[PDB]
Design a protein around this nucleic acid. Structure first.
Ligand code: ZN
Ligand code: ZN
Lengths: 87, 86
DNA sequence: GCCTGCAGGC
DNA sequence: GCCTGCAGGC
């Protein structure tokens, strides 16, 4: 993907939130900023807790198109994302 | 503590202790379970379903002797039950 | 228990 | 691409 953001249920409980530094629990809703790596080719996620993600400031107009993995979310979470972005 | 286990193969890496060929992921496989003296916990010796019977393993009552039996799909439950009889 | 293949994190 | 955890084999 070439999108700037990603959302998904945490594939493990091992990722740390770039903002608050705590672990992001398996299966919890997490969002990433996708960044290029200097050490190799490929994009790499910077993960945040859902709430942590929004605190750090974001002008996401249409979550459905800008955020990779939006469609694979449970419906009510797709809403939680829209309501939050629009806020 | 049952002596046998049956399940759909969790991976494709296990090798049949009768014929030596690999046991394909999700295929129906059977094990005799053995206690390890190197660590607490049982080691399974896996077989392709058919190979299991060709080495002299024997089961009268699958339901009770074979761990995992009742989570098999129905037709596989019947296959095991009949093969055991035969 | 040890190994290994690979998924997840970075 | 490097590191590590871990599931799955034995
Ligand atoms: Zn956080
Ligand atoms: Zn075999």
């Amino acid at each position: 993907s070439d999108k700037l953001y990603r959302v998904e249920y945490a594939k493990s409980g091992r990722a740390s939130c770039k903002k608050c530094s705590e672990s992001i629990p398996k299966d919890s809703l997490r969002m990433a900023i996708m960044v290029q790596s200097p050490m190799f080719d490929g994009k790499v996620p910077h993960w945040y807790h859902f709430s942590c993600f929004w605190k750090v400031g974001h002008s996401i107009r249409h979550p459905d198109v800008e955020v990779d993995g939006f469609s694979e979310l449970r419906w009510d979470d797709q809403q939680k994302v829209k309501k939050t972005a629009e806020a």
